[PDB]
Design a protein around this ligand. Sequence first.
Ligand SMILES: [Fe+3]
Ligand SMILES: [Fe+3]
Lengths: 345, 345
Amino acid sequence: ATVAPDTRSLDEIYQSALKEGGTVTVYAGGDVQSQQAGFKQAFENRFPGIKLNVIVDYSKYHDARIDNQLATDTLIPDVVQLQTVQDFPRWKKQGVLLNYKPVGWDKVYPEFRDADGAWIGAYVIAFSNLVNTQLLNEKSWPREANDYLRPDLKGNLILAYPNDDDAVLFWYKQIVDKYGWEFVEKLQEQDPVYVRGTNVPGAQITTGKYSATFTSSGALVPAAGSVTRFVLPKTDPFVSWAQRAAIFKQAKHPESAKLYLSWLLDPQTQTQVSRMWSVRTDVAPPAGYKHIWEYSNTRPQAFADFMSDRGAVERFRAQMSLYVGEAKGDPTPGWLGLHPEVPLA
Amino acid sequence: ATVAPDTRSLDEIYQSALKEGGTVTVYAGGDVQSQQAGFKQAFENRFPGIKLNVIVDYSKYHDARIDNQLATDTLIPDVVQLQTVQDFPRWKKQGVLLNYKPVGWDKVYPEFRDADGAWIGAYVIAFSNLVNTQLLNEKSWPREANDYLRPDLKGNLILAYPNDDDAVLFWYKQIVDKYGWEFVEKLQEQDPVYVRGTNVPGAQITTGKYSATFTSSGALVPAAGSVTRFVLPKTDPFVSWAQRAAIFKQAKHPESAKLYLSWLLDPQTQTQVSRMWSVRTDVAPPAGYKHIWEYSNTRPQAFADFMSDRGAVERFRAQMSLYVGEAKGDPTPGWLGLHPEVPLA
Ligand SMILES: [Fe+3]
Ligand SMILES: [Fe+3]
């Protein structure tokens, strides 16, 4: 189907969605269910009568889960949203995605949406420096990769496993490109603590157990009283991308899915719920920042290009494994199995 | 450089190799060091004064290891020998392999050798049924995949993790192609015990802890008094391939490396040391068997084709992981790190 952007108001879509039973099911990529709590609360407050049944798991498990459900005709979710961005052109070509251009589609940065409406970039995520501002004064915030190699940061770093998350991995890819394998060798001499779940480094830095990490997302607008700060490099690369979302052709609740995607693109959602950059050209960067496509030291398309060559990703991942070891510990979302219909209890 | 098969006798190559210091270092794919003990013993007994410094690790770790050593100019081994067969044309194209047609090159089945001498099929491995013949009479040996679903085998199977070894994985790929995902579903209801290391199921079947496994190698001619038997299906597919070996262009001991490759193809090695099929057309299979390329229910090239598409391999691996869980336990070869120069202590 050839479609035009939805011309309905959010409330008009909501009236249609209400007739579908009161729930929309989203398989969302992430580390822990709480990372989507803010979206769920905001959505459900905005739309009484419709539950956002968002279920969080690592994107590399959700995409497999979806492929298997499609193979076995047991598809559960209405919507998929993941950082494994290469899946979306593949699912599109497979014919399993509903072409839908949500409200505001015309204002999305072209790179951040499919031309036919098969998928949409929902919001921007970036991985870079997160520092404890009480442990480190501003003049000593590590911002470039090699700052993390200075003597006083030995034993004070906590890092997400790069062999457990390809967005984390891509940070290392860009840095090895620039500084060589020697960076990775010297980094290990800092006795970093590696953990699964990209939420965990920020959590432990917040409680003052570690001082900094260079592969974390975070609020561009810190809360008053915050003891952490997301800080971009002055010159070194950082990782960024638009999290991709799509509606399945055979979704049981298509209008509820449309409501969800249109709500995600709404300027208020983009500025007050999403905590980093917007995918829209008519939404102002938070004061002090530029649009994500205006930074010379990141390139969201580069992450997409990276993710499209699985052999190249695999070969780089396995080499990183030899430096950091196998990814220890349980997966942070818990084990959802083949057919989760609700979040883990 | 265009080369012809080595026209020297083994003894001639051996005289040259003796001048190089008495060691040849081989990075060999495998689950545990003891799997190469037979080769090591036979080689060193045939060529006093030359040590086969064969170092065993999972192929998926050795190839990354080699890539990183190449990238950092820290290459250690003279010879690489792995099941990750797709690595060999890539290393060929990178220019890091020494073109060398060993003695007997002309008699290697064409599919099992590089046209230029960049690599050679060293010996044939197959994964299929291994049964305990004391626990199970012949009429009840499971041979077909669906035999393993019978009631009395519940709690009585031990299986290599398919998400820890791609040759193990390919067995499942072929069986899902034929029987669908339902086989994998029903298999989990049999409560199989999964383990890392393809040696481990056999080891535990041999002591009578389990009755059978369907992804193991084994002797085509069982030893006198054996309590296990390697048995092919009557009709279902099984996995087979020629393990590939190559000499590095910058091998420190090239004549010793050539001795090793020529020794691999020597009739005595192909008939008395290698325990499954030979890569040579002029080596008769044991009675009861045909050449590995004459079975309609296996195809060595299908495994090579499989392994060449890393994205397809990844997507199938991740789905299998949803059924069997993450691969638990330590890696069976131990942790060798970036630069092993000798086997682990
Ligand atoms: Fe990922
Ligand atoms: Fe493998």
